Amino acid sequence: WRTLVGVSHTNEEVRNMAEEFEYDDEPDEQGNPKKRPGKLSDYIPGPYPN
Amino acid sequence: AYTSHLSSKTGLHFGRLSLRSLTAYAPNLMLWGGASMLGLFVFTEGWPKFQDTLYKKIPLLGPTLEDHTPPEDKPN
């Protein structure tokens, strides 16, 4: 997402799209799987899981 | 008159280097120090720490080196 900044959108413009997608977080204190709204450092996710 | 002896001192030396040769060489040694300092000013120009301390203080080439991207199209 961060490579889109300064080419086609602004910083606050890419942060909204990255927050619109969801990724896998580090597991919580009980070891359960956890999701997370994305940041700039993440990658653009594909539609299919495999 | 008549001179029977040759009056001379033994100079000052460290085998090869002499004090006379050092005093004859010393301003060009200062010139080579300045030339090597300009060489370091060349080969350290892209270094942003040396840009912040030294090269942005230059009158006509100083503000030339700094960028003008706002904090809206920088990712970090």
Coordinates of C-alpha atoms in Angstrom, one line a residue:
Chain A
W1 CA 0.0 0.0 0.0
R2 CA 2.9 2.4 0.8
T3 CA 4.2 2.4 -2.7
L4 CA 0.8 3.8 -3.9
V5 CA 1.5 7.0 -1.8
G6 CA 2.9 9.8 -3.9
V7 CA 2.1 8.1 -7.2
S8 CA -1.7 7.9 -7.4
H9 CA -3.1 8.7 -4.0
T10 CA -2.2 10.6 -0.8
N11 CA -1.1 9.2 2.6
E12 CA -4.5 9.7 4.2
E13 CA -6.1 8.4 1.0
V14 CA -4.2 5.1 1.1
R15 CA -4.7 4.6 4.8
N16 CA -8.5 4.4 4.3
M17 CA -8.2 1.6 1.7
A18 CA -5.7 -0.3 3.9
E19 CA -8.1 0.0 6.8
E20 CA -10.9 -1.2 4.6
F21 CA -9.0 -4.5 4.2
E22 CA -8.2 -6.9 7.0
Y23 CA -5.1 -9.0 7.7
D24 CA -3.8 -11.6 10.2
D25 CA -2.5 -10.1 13.5
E26 CA -0.2 -11.6 16.1
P27 CA -2.2 -13.9 18.3
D28 CA -3.7 -12.5 21.6
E29 CA -2.8 -13.4 25.1
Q30 CA -4.8 -16.7 24.9
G31 CA -3.2 -17.8 21.6
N32 CA -6.4 -17.4 19.6
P33 CA -6.2 -16.2 16.0
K34 CA -6.8 -12.5 15.5
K35 CA -7.6 -10.1 12.7
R36 CA -6.4 -6.5 12.3
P37 CA -7.2 -3.5 10.1
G38 CA -4.3 -2.9 7.7
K39 CA -1.6 -0.3 7.6
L40 CA 0.6 1.2 4.9
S41 CA 3.3 -1.5 5.3
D42 CA 0.9 -4.3 4.3
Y43 CA 0.4 -5.7 0.8
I44 CA -2.6 -5.5 -1.5
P45 CA -4.6 -8.6 -0.8
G46 CA -5.9 -11.0 -3.5
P47 CA -9.5 -12.1 -3.6
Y48 CA -8.9 -15.8 -3.2
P49 CA -7.2 -17.5 -0.2
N50 CA -5.5 -20.2 -2.4
Chain B
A1 CA 92.0 36.9 3.9
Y2 CA 92.7 33.2 3.9
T3 CA 90.2 30.6 5.0
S4 CA 91.6 27.3 6.3
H5 CA 88.4 25.7 7.6
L6 CA 85.0 25.1 6.2
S7 CA 82.5 26.2 8.8
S8 CA 79.2 24.2 8.6
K9 CA 76.5 22.7 10.8
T10 CA 75.1 19.2 10.4
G11 CA 71.5 20.2 9.8
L12 CA 68.4 18.4 11.2
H13 CA 67.3 15.1 9.7
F14 CA 65.7 11.7 10.3
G15 CA 67.7 9.8 7.7
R16 CA 65.6 10.6 4.7
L17 CA 63.3 13.5 5.7
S18 CA 65.0 16.7 6.5
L19 CA 63.7 19.8 8.2
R20 CA 64.6 21.9 5.2
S21 CA 62.6 19.5 2.9
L22 CA 59.7 19.5 5.3
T23 CA 59.6 23.3 5.4
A24 CA 59.9 23.4 1.6
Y25 CA 57.1 20.8 1.3
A26 CA 54.7 22.0 4.0
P27 CA 52.4 24.5 2.1
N28 CA 51.8 21.9 -0.6
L29 CA 51.0 19.5 2.2
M30 CA 48.4 22.0 3.3
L31 CA 47.2 22.2 -0.3
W32 CA 46.9 18.4 -0.4
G33 CA 45.0 18.4 2.9
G34 CA 42.5 20.9 1.4
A35 CA 42.3 18.9 -1.8
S36 CA 41.5 15.7 0.1
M37 CA 38.9 17.6 2.2
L38 CA 37.3 18.7 -1.0
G39 CA 37.4 15.1 -2.1
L40 CA 35.6 14.0 1.1
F41 CA 33.1 16.9 0.5
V42 CA 32.4 15.2 -2.9
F43 CA 32.2 11.6 -1.9
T44 CA 30.1 12.4 1.2
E45 CA 27.5 14.7 -0.5
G46 CA 24.7 12.2 -0.6
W47 CA 25.1 11.5 3.1
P48 CA 22.1 13.3 4.7
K49 CA 23.9 13.8 8.0
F50 CA 26.7 15.7 6.3
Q51 CA 24.1 17.5 4.2
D52 CA 22.3 18.6 7.4
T53 CA 25.5 19.7 9.1
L54 CA 27.6 21.1 6.2
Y55 CA 26.2 21.2 2.7
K56 CA 22.8 22.9 3.3
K57 CA 24.7 25.8 5.0
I58 CA 26.1 26.7 1.5
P59 CA 24.6 29.9 0.1
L60 CA 23.7 29.0 -3.5
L61 CA 23.9 25.2 -3.4
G62 CA 22.5 24.7 0.1
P63 CA 18.7 24.9 -0.3
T64 CA 19.2 23.3 -3.7
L65 CA 19.9 19.9 -2.1
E66 CA 16.8 19.8 0.1
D67 CA 13.5 18.3 -1.1
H68 CA 10.0 19.9 -1.2
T69 CA 7.7 16.9 -0.8
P70 CA 5.0 17.6 1.7
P71 CA 4.0 15.1 4.5
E72 CA 1.0 14.0 2.4
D73 CA 2.8 12.1 -0.4
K74 CA 5.6 10.6 1.7
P75 CA 4.8 7.1 3.0
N76 CA 7.1 7.4 6.0

